[PDB]
Every structure is written in structure tokens, then in C-alpha cells.
Amino acid sequence: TYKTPGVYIEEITKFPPSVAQVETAIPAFIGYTQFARTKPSVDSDDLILKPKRISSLLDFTTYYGGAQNEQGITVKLTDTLIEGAENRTINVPEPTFKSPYLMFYSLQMYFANGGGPCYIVSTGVYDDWSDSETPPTINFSDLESGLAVIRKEDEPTLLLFPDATNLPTDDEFYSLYNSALMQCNDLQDRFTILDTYSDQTYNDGVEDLDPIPALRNGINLTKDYLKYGAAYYPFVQTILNYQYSADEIVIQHLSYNPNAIATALDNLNAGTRLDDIIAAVSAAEPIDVNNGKLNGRLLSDIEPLDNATYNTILLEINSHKVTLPPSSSMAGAYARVDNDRGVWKSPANIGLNYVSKPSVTVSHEEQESMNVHGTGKSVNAIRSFVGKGTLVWGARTLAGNDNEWRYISVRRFFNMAEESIKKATEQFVFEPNDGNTWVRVRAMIENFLILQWRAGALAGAKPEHAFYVKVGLGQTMTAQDILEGNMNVEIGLAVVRPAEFIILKFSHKMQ
Amino acid sequence: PSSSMAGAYARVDNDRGVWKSPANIGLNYVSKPSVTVSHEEQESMNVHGTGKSVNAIRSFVGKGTLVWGARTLAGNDNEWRYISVRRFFNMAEESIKKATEQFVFEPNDGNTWVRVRAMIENFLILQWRAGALAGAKPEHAFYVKVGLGQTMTAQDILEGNMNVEIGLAVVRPAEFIILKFSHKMQ
Amino acid sequence: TYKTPGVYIEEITKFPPSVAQVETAIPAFIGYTQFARTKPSVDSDDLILKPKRISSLLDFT
Amino acid sequence: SYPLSKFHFSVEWGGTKIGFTEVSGLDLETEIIEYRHGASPEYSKIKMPGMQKFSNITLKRGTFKSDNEYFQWYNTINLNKVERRDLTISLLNEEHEPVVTWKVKNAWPLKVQSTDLKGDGNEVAIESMELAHEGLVIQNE
Amino acid sequence: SYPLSKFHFSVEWGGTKIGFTEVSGLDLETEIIEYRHGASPEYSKIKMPGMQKFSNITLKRGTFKSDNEYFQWYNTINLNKVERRDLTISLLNEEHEPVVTWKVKNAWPLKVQSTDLKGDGNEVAIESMELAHEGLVIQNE
Amino acid sequence: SYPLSKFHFSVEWGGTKIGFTEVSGLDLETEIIEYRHGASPEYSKIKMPGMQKFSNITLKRGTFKSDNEYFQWYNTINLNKVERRDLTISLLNEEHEPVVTWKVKNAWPLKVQSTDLKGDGNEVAIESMELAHEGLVIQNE
Amino acid sequence: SYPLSKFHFSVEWGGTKIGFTEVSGLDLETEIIEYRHGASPEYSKIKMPGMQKFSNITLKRGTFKSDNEYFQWYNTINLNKVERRDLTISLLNEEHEPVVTWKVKNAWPLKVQSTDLKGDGNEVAIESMELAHEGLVIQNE
């Protein structure tokens, strides 16, 4: 609210914004938020299980809030002498206890990589911490509820779960993904993006398990379901920071020349209960033989004592970055390819934005079992290339040995074409079932396919070699279908598949 | 020394520019500092636990009385500890708002957003050309952003607000030079 | 760490430094060191089996 | 799937009106530096970029009663001083919003040309202006 | 809401008549001075205004019995002396009043061109004059 | 694989500005001593190096309001005394960093030349200076 | 941010008029003294300032009826006596005020040159003068 016409000046720190226009790659994201409201001034959460469409990160923030503050950051400062000179080191370790809520960070990566409008489904709001070593948990039943809700929406094409890797067990994780694949099979218009449970060996509570075999045994559905999704490995390191407050951070201070107790006494000595405190404290001077002046204080309480320490520590805290599963980055990448090259091209050999590096290095030889395997349950790799950065390498589905459906771009092209055609055919639903209708429907479908051919989506020198459409009594329908009100239309398409291998050969030129 | 320093600030802005530190300046009409400050005595003036730095006036042989040091009262501030950074920003901000006042009662729509953006970028290009900003090309020196879905929402359009975001790459000075000597040998 | 602006003087003995720009001849060297760390103030050796790229002898040290 | 047309546009130049009949000269150009040493197996030269140039911009409009702006801007020239302006040229969509924008730095007028008069001149009197400038940026998002 | 036409006008030049067939050359022009110092980050030049120029003015009319005025004015030239005149050119409204006026200082004639003759020349004999001058001011209120 | 261009450079001479229009005279020269004794089978001379010379350096810049530095340096001459300076000339890359540096010892000015004035002189007023020095070292690493 | 032009100036020389076509010769020059003793490790000389010189100043103007001033000043020479004058040359701004001033002490004329005559000489008759002087000071504040 401003009252005087004119120009106002503010000073802030942030990353610049990014938006995009996307028609064919709209994801839904199911998970936890800070709050969920329809108006800025309400007495409750209005949107907990209500899908909402968001155009940009600002719209998200407006109704759902930001990230949860981390409560696992500690600081250790040590004072020593070098040939009689003072020298100190400030060390801020990576936290071992982190907030389990990743939707905010996930969306930042999505928009950074070119994503457009999307659907948000809340499952609840962020819970609190029990202690500095005891974080909130993720409730499996809340994610199932959100999935049941999105099932009633028509617009979404991709399904993602930003907080699935934080579920208490791997069994719950795999169960959630099996349900998502089954939903895609029943609706015939969706595709899922999958992560491993962890990018490192995980502890089952009874055994040490390797993440790739884990996922392969975890997802046990057949061909009909596997054709509707794909998986990526490893996790990636981003350039995003952590959200925190100096009020929650405590400093340990060690010194070659201790003075924590003496400091407390000088201040305490500066009524009956005050005397008891001082005596109790002075008794400890013989005990403390390691701690310096700042030991035990919070960052926000030492700035006036030494703002060089305060500022140095904040700078060190800022050097720690966020690590994420790659699924939201891939949803972003899918949108970029559809806009620049088309849905019929493979979503691979794509650079990712805001990625420093893969968390795990994958060698050439190590990928052979990821691309080709006896089970067909292929995994695509994220790899670092010299002079190029982090690229998506490979584009197969979870049915990698399927002669018709092994490539992602074939499955996605068909889903697109099928959706567009049925929208076009709905205008004829209550028309008479006769020759006049059969001709109108056929002509409409062929015109659509001619345009797809003209744009280079279909194979063939002329439309006659790219597709066919058939309808008629004695061809696709019988007398019984006419009596029951059925209409049968048959369509066939010629679709182009990519090359994967290039072999070079060298020799010594001779006559 | 405060009136002498106001004079000195004006000289630097005219000969070198507002983005250069107001230090290593000789003062006119000054015989000497009233109190001598040694090298060691200044260590606690430039760097201190509270950040409340004090600049020193010192006498140099063959040079006369010089201004030594150019920090603000927030000396441990990673963004604002130098005087020349704070002053450069105040200058740039004042010049830009004078330029934006011509658009105050214009319609809040795409045609205006484009005109405002273009005007601001032209100003910043000239500052870059003159050497005030860091970067090989303007693309590395600054950015300007405005738009619905980027800086504004539907609610801002309804209330008549317009949001413009600007970022700048600014150069900071070196303070210490260390020389090392040895006996040359094969 | 220095606190007063100005020129400091030190006296040392050493061979002068040398650097070069090379694109086609990058070696790897495998062996033992005094320590192996990513930061000057750590409680352990961080880099024992981690490859690192070095531009000059000062970076190595 | 279709290209843009060339007849719906606007020009912001600091004047009262933004409608023009014709706009031309929005060009960018770079010089070439050539080289060959005597021992080369090829008998042609290697090329690299030199210094940069910009073209002058021409604007055309119809003459209207009580609008003397071309003259008034031109008449701000005083020995080496002139009022310099930021020139924004934009190609519009069906909502009358910008699609393609040409941003021009530090423009001022080299020349102002008036209309000819004819006894049988059954047409509109058109005036024109030629502008110097120091740089062009093209935006199409 | 409509622009001015180009066929109703008059010229005051000190002669007996004010009707002309054609008027052209009412132009203004300024020179450019360019500069670049070697340390600049930009690889192009900065521009500023130089000296000013004016174009010559051409007037065309039909030949009439007993009117020898083009010649008589031209014939006032005597070594470096000539009769100089104030030339006023005006574009008229429906009441035959001025709308746009071009004011020209110190004019005199550089050349007078006569008509060609043809056996099958079924047309009007047109004479013309070219004038030098020292300055132009444009008024449109 | 490509040679350096000659238009992006800077000069450090103790003045307020480092931009110049033109720099020339960065030369090195050695004398020859010749000899032949009468009994030699060859009828030509043997050659060896003599004493060394340096050329004067010329700097050219445009005249600006309130900058009188060429004059002020020249005016430090007092019988045999003058302010001597270290002159550093550098050819720059795309990051505006040095590539080739010419280091000049003990420079001072022999002469300062002002601009000519012309009534039709539609151009920039350029001043120039000529410098004496005691030695040149060339660095290109 | 822009340099000064070279066409707007005035000259005060004690005459009735201050307008000139051309002004040149505003130079300053110093001699060099060189030295080397035989034991020096360097095989080149050390340099220091010598005595000073000034150039003559040339002024050019068009010939006008009844103005004989170049001649009248020249004709004040009588054996070793001459009228000496203070010469002030100034480069002007847009308000016609001084920007850069050249101050010249004790000037008098060495020579006066008249115009050539030609039957087909379609141009202005220009006279010129060359002046001796004893010193030049340059002011630019």
C-alpha cells in the first residue's frame, strides 16, 4: 500500500525470475506447503486438497508460502598460535539433520529449466521439529490422498512427487509409484517420471541395498504399465541456498587460552539469587580448560561483541548448497524440447540449468547395464561432459526391450496425437450413425494428420505413406454396432525412431 | 576536518568519478594533523570488533597531509563497508528515479513496461561505457526486469502498482600491498 | 591478515615461480602428500581419494 | 506457424503523436580484417571482425495543422549541443501490444525535409526526418 | 483528423504574380563530427553536430505574353551586386489564408532556364528559376 | 591462429585520462662499425654493433573543457630541471587486460603543439605532445 | 563527454575587426642537451632541457573595401622601432564566451602578403600576415 504518487526505492537480494509459455507439458505436483489459502486474510487453510493452477513461482508463493527453516546448522570456532601470532579458524559443517520438505526448491528448479503453468495439490502443511536432531516426517497416507484427488482432473500430463524420497521406508516409496503407473494405464493420457530412493547404498534395516537393483525389484508391474514411465539416476547438486535464521545457530569456541568462565564472571559481577549464581559460576573456573569467550552464544547475540565473527560465519553458512532428485528438472527440460524441436524428438542431449554437477560420477562402462538389461527396466543417466556441462544422456522407457514402445518420444508423440484427435471428435457425439457422419469424421481426422506430416512429425514422401484412416459398414462396423449405436474408426501412423550409436574407424592412408 | 572532507569529496567526483575511493588525497590549507597517528595505532581504527571504523588523517614525507582510509561505520559489511560503493549506488538511484517520473500517470500495461525498461538500460549502458561498472560487455554488468508473471501479479495491476527489478556489478578497491625481498642466486 | 592500509615488507629465500598455458598435455600424478584438505580449517583429510585440478605449485601447496 | 505482417507498429520519440507512415534503416554492420602469411598452403586469406557501424534512421509522416514538432526538435541544436532522445520502435500484435522491439540510444536529427508543391498534385503532403544515433539492441522474446 | 493536401499555395517574391506550377527544395541539413579514443570499451564512434547547409529553391511557371520578370530580376546582377529579396511561401486553407509558412532570407537567382521548342510539341511552354538564399524558418501554429 | 588488431589500447602517463587518439615512435636502433684489412681475400667489410639510439614518442588527443595537462607538465621545466615520468603503453584484449606492453624510462616533453583554427573547419580540435626518454623494454608473454 | 570543435573563435589584435579565416603556429619548443661518460654500463646518452623557442603566427582574412590595417601596422616600422602589441586568441562556446585562451606577448609583423590576380579566378581575394613574438601562455580552466 502506497499513498503518495511517485517512485519508491527498495533494496533486496534474490535470483531473477523466469517464465515460459507451454502447451503440451503440464505437470502436477503433489506434496506439503507452509499454508494453503484462497485469500491473504483467512482464518484457515482452504486449499489443502484442492488442485489449483499456477502460472509462475510468484503465484505459488502467494497461496502456498516458501521453504521451512533448517534447524541443523551448528558452528565451531578455534583459536591457536602460530610462532606466537594469533590465528583462528571458523568451521561450519554440512548439517546431518535437514527439513524433509522439498516442494519449494523443486519448483524453483522447474521454472529455471523452462517450465510453464502447472497444477499444485497440497497434501497438508509443514509440521514442526521435536528437537534439533529430530525432524518432521512424511505421511504416506497424505500422498495417496493427493493422488486420488488429481485423478479427477483432465488437464495434467505428467505426475510428480517432490517429497517421496523422504518416506520412512522404501516399501512405501515403491508402492506410491506402482499406483501412479496404474493410474496412467487406466486413463491412457499420462506419463510418470521416477527417481531412485537414494543415490547411495541404503540400509533396509536388515541388509545394504544398491539403488539400481532396488528400483528394479521395487517396481513389479508388467509391460502395460512400464510403457508409461521412465527413470533417471543420479541426484544432482544445485546452486540454491538453505533457508535459516541466526537466532537458531549456536557457536562452540575453543582456545589455546580459555576464558569462557572468566568472561561470564566479569559480567555477572557487574540480590540474594545473584550471589548464588556468581558463587556457582566461580566454582567452575578450574574446570573449563578449553573454552573461549564466545562459547555457547547464538550468532544473533554476538554481532556487537565481534561483528567480524558474526559476518564470517554467515558467509560460511552460505557456502552450503541444496541437493535434489532430478525429476523436476526433467519436467522443465521436457517443456523446452517440445517448444524448440517438437514432441516427436528425444528428450536427451539437453543441458540442465542451475546444476553444478551430478552427485555420483557414472563412467562409460558403468552405463552399459543402465541402458540395456535382461529385465528391460532401463535407467537414463545424468552425466558431465567436458566443455558442455551436465547433460541428459539416454531416452528410453521402463519397457526398454519393447519393439514398439522402448523410446520416450514415440510414447509421448502417440499420447499427444490421441488426445488432440478425441477433442476434435467430441463435436459428433450425438449425431446420427450413418454415412453422412462417417464421411465428416474421416475427413476431419485426415486433415489433422496431413498437418502433422507437413510439419515433419510423420515418416513418408507423401501423406499416402504416412497414415491411413478407415471407417464404414463392412470395413470397421457390423449390423450389430449400428443397432447398439457404436461407431468404429481405425487409424495407422508411420513414426520415426532415433539412432543411438556412431562408430568411427581409422587407418593409415595408402595407395 | 569535516568541511575539508566535503571539499575533497567534490574534487574526487570531478577528476576520477564517484565510484573511486575518497582517499590518498592531499588537503589544501593544512599545515599538519593536530595529533600524530602511527602505523600500529591505526590498526584498531580500520578494523574493529564493532565495525565502527574511523578513517585517519596522516602526514607523509614529501607528500604532506593525506586522507588515509575510506570505510563506512559498517566496516564489516560485505556489501556496504566501502564509501565509494554506498555513494555510487545513491547516485545511480537518484538519477534513475528522476528519469522515471515522466511515466507516473501512464497506463499500466505492456507498452509502458517496454518504454521504462529501455530507458533504464540506456542509462546503465552509458555508466558501463564510462568504466563505472564491471564486466566485458553490458550483459555482464547489469540486468533490468519487468513484467506480469516476473515482477508483478494480477493484484498489482488492479491496485496500480508497477515493479521493476535492477541488478549491478560494482568494483571494489585493494587495500594491502606486500613486498618480499631476497638475495638473487642461481 | 593485515589491518592497516599500506605497504608491508618481508624477507624470504626461494626459487622464483613459473606457470604455463597447456591444452593437449594434461598429466595425472598419483602418490602421497602431507595432508589432503578442501579448506584450511578442517578436522581431517577430505581429499585422500578425490582427484583435484591444480593450476600451479601454489595451489598444490 | 505463420510469419508476422509489416503494417501495424508504433514509434515513441518524445513527441505528441506515435503514428508514422514509414520507418527505415534499422541495420547493424561490422568490418573485416584480412591476413595471409607467405608460407601458407592456401592461396586465400583468413578473416576476423573489425570495428562496428550503424545506419541512420528515416521517419515519414503526414503534415497536420498546428503540429510543428520536427522543426522544434531540430531547432534545439546550438553549436555542439542538441537534445538527445531515447527512441523506441515496436511491432504490434492484435491486442496492440509489443512483439518485436528495436531500442535506439542517443538519437538527434541530421536533417528535416519538407514537401514539394504542385498545381496538379492531388496527394497528401508528407514530411520526413533523418536521425543519427549511437547504438541498436533488438528484443524478441 | 485529416492531413493537409499539396495543391493550394502561393508565393510572394516581389513580382507581379503569385501563381506557380511547381515549388521544390525547402530543406535543412547539418554535418556530423565523429570521435573515438583508443581506450573505449565500445568499438564505434560518438557523434555531435557540425556546420549547417541549405538547398537551392526551384520555381516553375508558364510563359505569358508581356511578362519578362524572371529575366529582369536576373539582369540586376552587376559584378558582385544583385537585388536580394525576402521570399515567402505559403500553404493555404479553404478561406485562402495561410496555414504553413516557409520564410526565406536574402534570395537571388543563380539561373534562369527557358523552354525547348518542338514541331509536334502539343503542350504549355514552361520557364523555371533556381534561387540561392541564406536561411529558412518554418512556421506552423 | 589470428594476429592482433591495432585499435584497443591505453596509456599511463601520470595524467587524469588514459585515452588517446594516436601513439607512434616505439623504435630501437643500433649503429654499425665496419672493418677490412688489406690482405683479406674478400673485397668487402666485416660488421659489428656500435652505440645505441632511441626515437622520440608522439601522443595525440582531442581538446576538452577544463583539461590543461599537456601544458602543466611542460611548464614544470626550470633551467635544467623537469618532472620525469615512467610511461607505460599497453595493447589490450577483450577483457580489457594487457597483452603487449611497452615500458619507457625517464620521459619528459620536448614540445607541445596546439590546434589550427579555420572558418570552415568542420572537425575536432586535436592537440599533441612529443616526448624524450632514456630507454624502452618490450614485454609479450 | 565530447571534445571541442575548431571553427568558432576570435582574435584581438588592436585592429577594428576580430574575424579571421585562418589562424596557425601556436607552438612551444625546447632544445635537448645530451651526455655520456666513458665508464657508463649503458651505451646511450642521458638527456636534459636546453634553451627555448617559439614559432611565428600566421593570420589570414578576406580583403574589404576601405580597410588597410595590415599595411598600416606594418608601416609603423622605423629603423629598429615598431609598434608592439598584445595578441589574444580565443576559442568560443555557444554563448560566444572564451573557453581556451592563447596569450601572446610583444608581437609585431615580419611580413604582409597580398593576393594574386587571375582572369578566371572565381574566388575571394585573401590577404595574410606573419607575426614575430616573445612568448606564449595557454589558459584552460
Author numbering:
A (entry chain 4F): 3 to 272, 450 to 690
B (entry chain 3A): 505 to 690
C (entry chain 3F): 3 to 63
D (entry chain 4a), E (entry chain 4b), F (entry chain 3a), G (entry chain 3b): 2 to 142
Kindly provide excerpts from the paper associated with this entry.
Their conserved modules include an inner tube, a contractile sheath and a baseplate complex. For firing of the extended apparatus, the baseplate undergoes a conformational change and triggers sheath contraction, which in turn causes the inner tube to be expelled and injected into a target. Here we performed structural and mechanistic studies on a clade Ib CIS gene cluster in the marine bacterium Algoriphagus machipongonensis PR1.
Six protofilaments of sheath proteins adopt a right-handed helical array with a length of 92.4 nm and an outer diameter of 24.6 nm. Unlike the multiple sheath proteins present in PVC/AFP, the AlgoCIS sheath is composed of only one protein, Alg2, which folds into four domains. The conserved domains I and II contribute to the sheath wall, with additional domains III and IV extending outwards. The sheath subunits are interwoven with each other via a conserved ‘handshake’ and iteratively assemble into the full sheath, where the attachment helix in domain I mediates the interactions with the inner tube. Interestingly, depending on its location in the different sheath layers, Alg2 exhibits pronounced structural variations. The hinge angles of domain IV were also observed to be different when comparing the different Alg2 layers. A lowpass-filtered map indicates that there are two potential conformations of domain IV in the central sheath layers. The inner tube subunits possess the conserved β-barrel structures and the N terminus of Alg1 is shorter than that of Pvc1 and Afp1.
